[PDB]
Design a protein around this ligand. Structure first.
Ligand code: CLA
Ligand code: CLA
Ligand code: CLA
Ligand code: CLA
Ligand code: CLA
Ligand code: CLA
Ligand code: CLA
Ligand code: CLA
Ligand SMILES: CC1=C(/C=C/C(C)=C\C=C\C(C)=C\C=C\C=C(C)\C=C\C=C(C)\C=C\C2=C(C)CCCC2(C)C)C(C)(C)CCC1
Ligand SMILES: CC1=C(C/C=C(\C)CCC[C@H](C)CCC[C@H](C)CCCC(C)C)C(=O)c2ccccc2C1=O
Ligand SMILES: CC1=C(C/C=C(\C)CCC[C@H](C)CCC[C@H](C)CCCC(C)C)C(=O)c2ccccc2C1=O
Ligand code: SF4
Lengths: 74, 74, 80, 739, 41, 73, 163, 142
């Protein structure tokens, strides 16, 4: 029974680290928003254009990664 | 015992999330790729898609199999 | 207010003006192929930052980008 | 009024299937993005989005109606055939008191056969809480050989229904002149479809009241009971059973209705031994309904200068304040199908919930009052259906206002007057919701605080300080004294929920009067609060759809859009679609609170087993001093009643716990969508696509994340799915182990 | 007939034909072979 | 509450409340010092996650303390 | 003896659990006559339950202090013993099937990149082509390794990136 | 010749609504629109209901600027009618905004000089180095 729970903890850690590393690496510029370095760090979004751009700033990845941090530590 | 353990666990979780947040703030705000033409940080930024994809893969693996074994046992 | 810019990547489709809801930007001389217009932002006291002009701009990459700045009565769309 | 159809309007061919999205020229070009599939699905029924041909739209709707009724009939036939082939209906029929209904038997594969609960009747299977055995017992069915033929008839009718749909779409496609015959549609729905059906069903209940009322309730085995045809034709039989027959059918010709008293009877109530009601009351009710809806469908001028049309009636209704009202509401309805659909769904769900309230306290069937599970199931089912229907009416109101509306020909001073003060209503309802929240929810906070501070004599209680209602009690008093004072010919009251006379069948009390104290007062205020907040959401979505204070050019953006832009501080969830999004959550909240109130009241102060000395309920009357606190709902109701759902793996109820956990899972899964966006997900898909292109295995169709509107749709879908499924599993695993 | 066979390449085909084949195969293997949890050797 | 419902919805309701507050008879005395608007989207999700985290923490801590220091077993 | 676990025949808890299950089955099996259908159903269920408990205890699978079976997943502990089937060969079987699937899907999606409007082929599949490729992938380990040495699977860095 | 605002102008026949016209319109600003409207007709208001409109130039006014650009665009949509805008400050000073060129900013007028623009390919901007000043949002050329 410790096997399963250690693997659940590994899932939580890898997912939180995924969210954080993704928010960090796609910071200077991503393929959807190439000039992300111009709007700083914590901006709401880049507008409803281009099929929808919601929670695209790295601050939002940190948002979701804090959700997963709560889950993993729980 | 349990109170202090959970205390330090959530403290460490928030501190790690903050570490990653400031790591992203670095790329956003304080970065000079001119000085960094050829270092390991530029290399890490260059294959970022591979890092993100393998994190996604390990997460998918863990989630799939953990939830599958739990649902199977249930 | 909202710092609006227009880069040289433009074709003068006259669409980001017939789409702007606040009549903020103009189109005055440009040396193009068939239409020959280029957009410009002469005034920003009324621009709210709705990013409706960025949705219609077909340039890749976009010709106009709204640098979000500070808010005011016009920038917050406040009838009060 | 006449008939107007066209011959071969659309040739029958499998070509238009090979091009999905043909109805949307934007989609028919090709799937260059994975959003194409989701738009194909989300727009196939959007008939007014295909083209502005309201004739074709009406034809599509009138065909989809048959398309739905065919599925309805195949569903009923499937229920009847399950009851026929594999079920204990004969065993249940010979002994309804203890044998439980079962009509589903699983296959032995991986141990799922444990679900075949031991229900008796020489047969094992899955217990059903739909209420089909009690409904069939009221039809004189004696053996399984009848349900086969009934299902055969139903399936033939469903096939004919699909045939009629295809016929009126591709061979007899009508015109807008026929669809817009409001006069004909009413006088044939109201008079024919309703009156004729009610009269037929009343005549049925009149000639089927022999077995249920007399033979079935006399220990006579169903095989022993003469078949219904042996009761119908033979006059000696119906003369021995009911003396009012074989007279000569004289009183009905000369209208001297004096001798017909053995089969059209008005009693009210039920015998604490018979368990159920009598068929004579239902027969008289259906004859009243037939006469009423048949006469009501004869109050409109159609052809022969007799009556008055709807347009003149609408024109002859004007007042001082409004002036020139009801100018074009007839055109409002005859123009758009969305207006009619919203108007229907408006009170359709409300009447569904009213049917739930009239069924839980008035079981119109035999041998189901002791069945404490079917009542909860049907009640909660109909209430959730009513909530969904009301939210859908709120949505289709805005839908009408978006596409099919223009205040020039459909102009009405009523609607524009409602629009001209569209903000005072919202502000005052905001204030009223604040009032109710501080005055219906804060009371629970006060009660918890008082119980925690060590002052039980200060907490709100039926013993410390009473806060119970009297108006509902005065209504119950007027209904209780109604017999012999305000209802002379009546025998009993409206319901046994306020008239004592504890009726019990086999230990289990079939019905006991329901009390109303401070707890019910508080819970009804919570219900009013939630319902008012839901109505606020829906109406503020409907009104602020054509125009608003922030964005005037709001009608051109359509009905289904997420926002306008991050300008003016931020615009999110501004469309009426998003208001329906939030109204779904609020309807969930309200209906859940109401159903929990129902369940816990019924289990604490109503249901139980009667001993020699009084009745011993399920719970020890935990409703009094637990509802006054939020912790009480977790003290004696949620914590206490959840033992079975988590303790049912050892029996045939483990599937209930499985659905329980799975619904929790899908609920949190919905939370995922509800709290996230697309930027993160789109960039993650970008990196995954990078990983793909390295091995050259990516798809030709551009894989994009779900649309913002579709993101919110998936969120709300999984959210309501998880919620309703968890509550279903709970209410359906708890009530089986206590009945 | 031709347009019907063309229609039979969409969701109502493999995705139904598939996963029906697979559910049937797995159920039959678990039916004839009742309860496996480890290989023969 | 702060996570599911987003900003744009609340701007119209705040404008409605402003309409109501400016028209209340004899209640138009000394005004608010700053205009009321809806929380920023960034602010909205920040406060939502703050409530999320703090409620998560308080609930789990109250459980871990009560279910332990009340029974001793 | 590995990990303090004992072979699952010598587990008193395992036999106690089997007896418990059989008693729980028989207590409600005694409700029906030997001729009816439910009785035969319970008889067959008990048959394959006894078969469960008998067939497991062969070639050795360790049950712990709880009496329940415990899978050994380390190669090396499944070797030097008889546990190679717990999870060692199932790994290779799934790898084979997953290869098969990915190989077939990749060769399909590649052979469709050449014709006009390949997107259609992704919503209206080429059923005969899919059937042909479905009956040609059961040698994929051979084709994969030599298609790797070939180089026809490495894209020479001609994709869309942002950095 | 850009026309300036003229008070004492008649208004269209309408009952009332609950949109705009708040304390902001009295002490901060209010916007004005004027347009021809021949062939007395029915129109829709952006912050109300339907109304009638006489022939001959008629003038309206609202609270927010978009509330009038919406009407200008509508007028484009159906029948070719050519309204204008006006601004008002606290001192009563009036400013004419739309259309300054008289040809509807979507179309060029004979010749002007625009600002807030730079001749540079999309992207290729400056990294955060040497941008410590940050001047709010940089024009990148000033
Ligand atoms: C219980 C709720 C829930 C669930 C189930 C998930 C599940 C998942 N999240 Mg998530 N998340 C949640 C809540 C949830 N989240 C919330 C509330 C937030 C904050 C709002 C986040 C924020 C978040 C982020 C930021 C990310 C994720 C990611 C992921 C995925 C990681 C994949 C993985 O690890 O392996 C698999 C996990 C699974 C859940 C698979 C199980 C699903 C099974 C297979 C369903 C099968 C159904 C059956 C076959 C047929 C049903 C279909 C139809 C018939 C009805 C995963 C699918 C990460 C991701 O996308 O991975 C790359 C990602 O970065 N989540
Ligand atoms: C009303 C919808 C409906 C639903 C949800 C079901 C569901 C079910 N039926 Mg059923 N059935 C229906 C209508 C329905 N039926 C009708 C109208 C008929 C008359 C033709 C039948 C006649 C029928 C038979 C003869 C059998 C079932 C059986 C079954 C079960 C096997 C699952 C299966 O393969 O189903 C069908 C798969 C695709 C449709 C299943 C739970 C089997 C069963 O329960 O075993 C006794 C069984 O053999 N049904
Ligand atoms: C719903 C339609 C309907 C139909 C098809 C019938 C059909 C029939 N009725 Mg009936 N009846 C009906 C409604 C109907 N009834 C209603 C609503 C009432 C209540 C007023 C009655 C009260 C009634 C009586 C009292 C009798 C019949 C009788 C009969 C049978 C012979 C008399 C006759 O032809 O008429 C016949 C098969 C007679 C009968 O039972 O046959 C011996 C008879 O005595 N009916
Ligand atoms: C007889 C009942 C009924 C009917 C005929 C319709 C019909 C319609 N609805 Mg609707 N709806 C209903 C009940 C009904 N609804 C109820 C009770 C609710 C509350 C949950 C909703 C909530 C709802 C929403 C939120 C939306 C619709 C939409 C639509 C349109 C497109 C649906 C579609 O194909 O998407 C896909 C169908 C299945 C995936 C369509 C004309 C959509 C629309 O655009 O409105 C025009 C839309 O977004 N409906
Ligand atoms: C703990 C969760 C929570 C709470 C407490 C509330 C509370 C409230 N909601 Mg909300 N909501 C929630 C979750 C919650 N919601 C979620 C998850 C959603 C997503 C669907 C929504 C969506 C939603 C909408 C769309 C709306 C509300 C509205 C409201 C307000 C209604 C007015 C009222 O009097 O209520 C109760 C009042 C209180 C609880 C205040 C308590 C004051 C304390 C006890 C006094 C402390 C004083 C102290 C001494 C200092 C109210 C304050 C409506 C609104 O804005 O008003 C009309 C509104 O339109 N909610
Ligand atoms: C890939 C799916 C799949 C497969 C491989 C099978 C395979 C088989 N089925 Mg089955 N079946 C399936 C799906 C499937 N079925 C589904 C979906 C249903 C529901 C309609 C059934 C219902 C069904 C029934 C009712 C029966 C079978 C039977 C059989 C066996 C007869 C073949 C035989 O012995 O001839 C010779 C083989 C080699 C010479 C066979 C091994 C028969 C059986 O049990 O065997 C006696 C039988 O009675 N099947
Ligand atoms: C949208 C969120 C929001 C926020 C963050 C605030 C914040 C604030 N409001 Mg405000 N308010 C709001 C909505 C909001 N309000 C709404 C919707 C209304 C309409 C009913 C009001 C009506 C209002 C009034 C009438 C007053 C404030 C005042 C204040 C300030 C308190 C000053 C003080 O302590 O003096 C005392 C606080 C009280 C007497 C209470 C404060 C910064 C006060 C102020 O600005 O000081 C002059 C003030 O008197 N507000
Ligand atoms: C990350 C993967 C992994 C891990 C964690 C382990 C871990 C372990 N292995 Mg193992 N092994 C692995 C992969 C792995 N193995 C693979 C892929 C193979 C196939 C070649 C083997 C074949 C293997 C054998 C044949 C044996 C082990 C044994 C062991 C145990 C003692 C280590 C040892 O060999 O002696 C010391 C290591 C010196 C470098 C140890 C717990 C031994 C054992 O059973 O323990 C008694 C044993 O004899 N392994
Ligand atoms: C002695 C010993 C040992 C050994 C050990 C080793 C040798 C190892 C290791 C290890 C390690 C070594 C671990 C780790 C950790 C790590 C971490 C934890 C990390 C981190 C990082 C981060 C977090 C980052 C951040 C950032 C970002 C985000 C971006 C930008 C940049 C920066 C940096 C800012 C053992 C115990 C085995 C056993 C006993 C003895
Ligand atoms: C994950 C996620 C997505 C991504 C959603 C996705 C990728 C849905 C895709 C899943 C479907 C089920 C893929 C299935 C299609 C298969 C490739 C083929 C079907 C299988 C056959 C057998 C039928 C959003 O779009 C989103 C939007 C707004 C807020 C939150 C979120 C959000 O959290
Ligand atoms: C209710 C609600 C509002 C409106 C809420 C308002 C206007 C209340 C916030 C201001 C009042 C005055 C809060 C009163 C005091 C607070 C309880 C605590 C303040 C303490 C600070 C001084 C630290 C939003 O603006 C919003 C924005 C984005 C997403 C969701 C929502 C949302 O749900
Ligand atoms: S919309 Fe973009 S491309 Fe078109 S004229 Fe304006 S700036 Fe140029």
């Amino acid at each position: 029974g410790d096997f399963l729970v250690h693997h659940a903890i590994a899932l939580g850690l890898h997912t939180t680290t995924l969210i954080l590393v993704k928010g960090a690496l796609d910071a200077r510029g991503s393929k959807l928003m190439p000039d992300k370095k111009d709007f700083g760090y914590s901006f709401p979004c880049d507008g409803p254009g281009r099929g929808g751009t919601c929670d695209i700033s790295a601050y939002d990845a940190f948002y979701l990664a804090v959700f997963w941090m709560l889950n993993t530590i729980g | 015992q349990a109170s202090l353990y959970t205390h330090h666990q959530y403290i460490a979780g928030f501190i790690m999330c903050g570490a990653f947040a400031h790591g992203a703030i670095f790329f956003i705000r304080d970065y000079d790729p001119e000085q960094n033409k050829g270092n390991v940080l530029a290399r890490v930024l260059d294959h970022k898609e591979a890092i993100i994809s393998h994190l996604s893969w390990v997460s998918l693996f863990l989630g799939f199999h953990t939830l599958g074994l739990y649902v199977h046992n249930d | 207010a909202h710092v609006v810019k227009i880069y040289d990547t433009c074709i003068g489709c006259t669409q980001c003006v017939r789409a702007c809801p606040l009549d903020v930007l103009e189109m005055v001389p440009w040396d193009g192929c068939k239409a020959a217009q280029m957009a410009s932002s002469p005034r920003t006291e009324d621009c709210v930052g709705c990013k409706r002009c960025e949705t219609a701009c077909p340039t890749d990459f976009l010709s106009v980008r709204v640098y979000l700045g500070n808010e005011s009565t016009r920038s917050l769309g406040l009838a009060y | 009024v006449k008939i107007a159809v066209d011959r071969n309007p659309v040739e029958t061919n499998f070509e238009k299937w090979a091009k999905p999205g043909h109805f949307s020229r934007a989609l028919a070009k090709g799937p260059n993005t994975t959003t194409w599939i989701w738009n194909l699905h989300a727009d196939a029924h959007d008939f007014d989005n295909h083209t502005s041909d309201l004739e074709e739209i009406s034809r599509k709707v009138f065909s989809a109606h048959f398309g739905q009724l065919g599925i309805i009939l195949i569903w009923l036939s499937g229920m009847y055939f399950h009851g026929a082939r594999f079920s204990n209906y004969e065993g249940w029929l010979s002994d309804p008191t203890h044998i439980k209904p079962s009509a589903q038997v699983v296959w032995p594969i991986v141990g799922q056969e444990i679900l075949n609960g031991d229900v008796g009747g020489g047969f094992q299977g899955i217990q059903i809480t739909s209420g089909f055995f009690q409904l069939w017992r009221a039809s004189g069915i004696t053996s399984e050989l009848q349900l086969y033929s009934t299902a055969i008839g139903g399936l033939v009718l469903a096939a004919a229904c699909f045939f009629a749909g295809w016929f009126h779409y591709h061979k007899a496609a009508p015109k807008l002149e026929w669809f817009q015959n409001v006069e004909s549609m009413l006088n044939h729905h109201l008079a024919g479809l309703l009156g004729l059906g009610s009269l037929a069903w009343a005549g049925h209940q009149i000639h089927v009241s022999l077995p249920v009322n007399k033979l079935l309730d006399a220990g006579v085995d169903p095989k022993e009971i003469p078949l219904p045809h042996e009761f119908l034709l033979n006059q000696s039989i119906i003369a021995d059973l009911y003396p009012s027959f074989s007279k000569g059918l004289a009183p009905f010709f000369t209208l001297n209705w004096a001798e017909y008293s053995d089969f059209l009877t008005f009693k009210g109530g039920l015998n604490p031994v018979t368990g159920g009601l009598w068929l004579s009351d239902t027969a008289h009710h259906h004859l009243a309904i037939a006469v009423l809806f048949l006469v009501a469908g004869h109050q409109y001028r159609t052809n022969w200068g007799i009556g008055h049309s709807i347009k003149d009636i609408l024109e002859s209704h004007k007042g001082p304040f409004t002036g020139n009202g009801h100018a074009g509401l007839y055109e409002i309805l005859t123009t758009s199908w969305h207006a009619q659909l919203a108007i229907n769904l408006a009170l359709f769900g409300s009447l569904s919930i009213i049917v739930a309230h009239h069924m839980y306290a008035m079981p119109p069937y035999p041998y189901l009052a002791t069945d404490y599970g079917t009542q909860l199931s049907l009640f909660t089912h109909h209430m959730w259906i009513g909530g969904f229907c009301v939210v859908g009416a709120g949505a289709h109101a805005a839908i009408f206002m978006v596409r099919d509306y223009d205040p020039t020909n459909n102009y009405n001073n009523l609607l524009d007057r409602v629009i001209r003060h569209r903000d005072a209503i919202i502000s005052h309802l905001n204030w009223v919701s604040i009032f109710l929240g501080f005055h219906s929810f804060g009371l629970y906070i006060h009660n918890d605080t008082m119980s925690a501070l060590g002052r039980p004599q200060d907490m709100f209680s039926d013993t410390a300080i009473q806060l119970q209602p009297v108006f509902a009690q005065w209504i119950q008093n007027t209904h209780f004294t109604a017999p012999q004072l305000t209802a002379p010919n009546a025998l009993a009251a409206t319901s046994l929920t306020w008239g004592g006379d504890v009726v019990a069948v086999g230990g289990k009390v079939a019905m006991m009067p329901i009390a109303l104290g401070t707890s019910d007062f508080l819970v009804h205020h919570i219900h009013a609060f939630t319902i008012h907040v839901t109505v606020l959401i829906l109406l503020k979505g409907v009104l602020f759809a054509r125009s608003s204070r922030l964005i005037p050019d709001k009608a051109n953006l359509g009905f289904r859009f997420p926002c306008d832009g991050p300008g003016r501080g931020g615009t999110c969830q501004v469309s009426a679609w998003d208001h329906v999004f939030l109204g779904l959550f609020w309807m969930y909240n309200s209906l859940s609170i109401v159903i929990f109130h129902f369940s816990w009241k019924m289990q604490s102060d109503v249901w139980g087993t009667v001993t020699d000395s009084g009745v011993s309920h399920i719970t020890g009357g935990n409703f009094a001093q637990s509802a006054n606190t939020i912790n009480g709902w977790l003290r004696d109701f949620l914590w206490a009643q959840s033992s079975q759902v988590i303790q049912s793996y050892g029996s045939a109820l483990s599937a209930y716990g499985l659905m329980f956990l799975g619904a929790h899972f899908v609920w949190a899964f919905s939370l995922m969508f509800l709290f996230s966006g697309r930027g993160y997900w789109q960039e993650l898909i970008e990196s995954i696509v990078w990983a793909h292109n390295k091995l050259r295995v990516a798809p030709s169709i551009q894989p994009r994340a779900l649309s913002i509107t579709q993101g919110r749709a998936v969120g709300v879908a999984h959210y309501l799915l998880g919620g309703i499924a968890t509550t279903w599993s709970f209410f359906l695993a708890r009530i089986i182990a206590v009945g | 007939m031709k347009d019907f066979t063309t229609y039979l390449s969409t969701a109502p085909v493999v995705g139904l034909g598939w996963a029906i084949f697979t559910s049937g195969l797995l159920i039959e293997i678990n039916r004839f072979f009742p309860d496996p949890l480890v290989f023969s050797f | 509450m702060f996570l599911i419902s987003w900003r744009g919805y609340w701007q119209e309701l705040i404008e409605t409340l402003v309409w109501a507050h400016e028209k209340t008879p004899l209640a138009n005395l000394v005004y608010w010092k700053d205009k009321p608007v809806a929380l920023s989207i960034v602010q909205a999700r920040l406060v939502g996650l703050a409530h999320f985290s703090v409620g998560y923490i308080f609930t789990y801590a109250a459980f871990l303390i009560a279910s332990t220091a009340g029974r001793f077993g | 003896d590995i990990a303090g676990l004992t072979p699952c025949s010598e587990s008193k808890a395992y036999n106690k659990l089997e007896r418990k299950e059989l008693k729980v089955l028989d207590k409600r099996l005694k409700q029906y006559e030997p001729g009816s259908a439910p009785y035969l159903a319970l008889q067959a269920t008990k048959e394959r339950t006894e078969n469960r408990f008998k067939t497991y205890a062969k070639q050795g699978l360790l049950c712990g202090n709880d009496g329940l079976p415990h899978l050994i997943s380390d190669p090396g502990l499944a070797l030097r013993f008889n546990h190679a089937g717990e999870v060692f060969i199932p790994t290779f079987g799934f790898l084979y099937v997953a290869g098969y699937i990915g190989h077939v899907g990749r060769q399909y999606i590649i052979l469709s990149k050449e014709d006009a409007k390949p997107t259609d082929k992704e919503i209206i599949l080429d059923v005969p082509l899919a059937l042909k490729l479905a009956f040609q992938g059961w040698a994929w380990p051979l084709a994969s390794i030599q298609e790797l040495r070939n180089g026809s699977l490495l894209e020479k860095d001609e994709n869309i990136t942002v950095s | 010749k850009q026309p300036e605002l003229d008070p004492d102008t008649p208004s269209p026949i309408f009952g009332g609504s609950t949109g705009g016209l708040l304390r902001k319109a009295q002490v901060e600003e209010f916007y004005v629109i004027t347009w021809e409207s021949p062939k007395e007709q029915i129109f829709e208001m952006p912050t109300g209901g339907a109304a009638i409109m006489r022939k001959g130039p008629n003038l309206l006014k609202f609270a927010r600027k978009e509330q009038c650009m919406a009407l200008t665009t509508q007028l484009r949509s159906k029948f070719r009618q050519t309204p204008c805008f006006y601004r008002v400050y606290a001192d009563g000073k009036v400013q004419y905004l739309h259309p300054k060129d008289g040809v509807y900013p979507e179309k060029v007028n004979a010749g002007r000089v625009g600002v807030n623009q730079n001749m540079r390919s999309i992207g290729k901007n400056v990294d955060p180095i040497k941008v410590v000043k940050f001047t709010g949002s940089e024009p990148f050329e000033i």
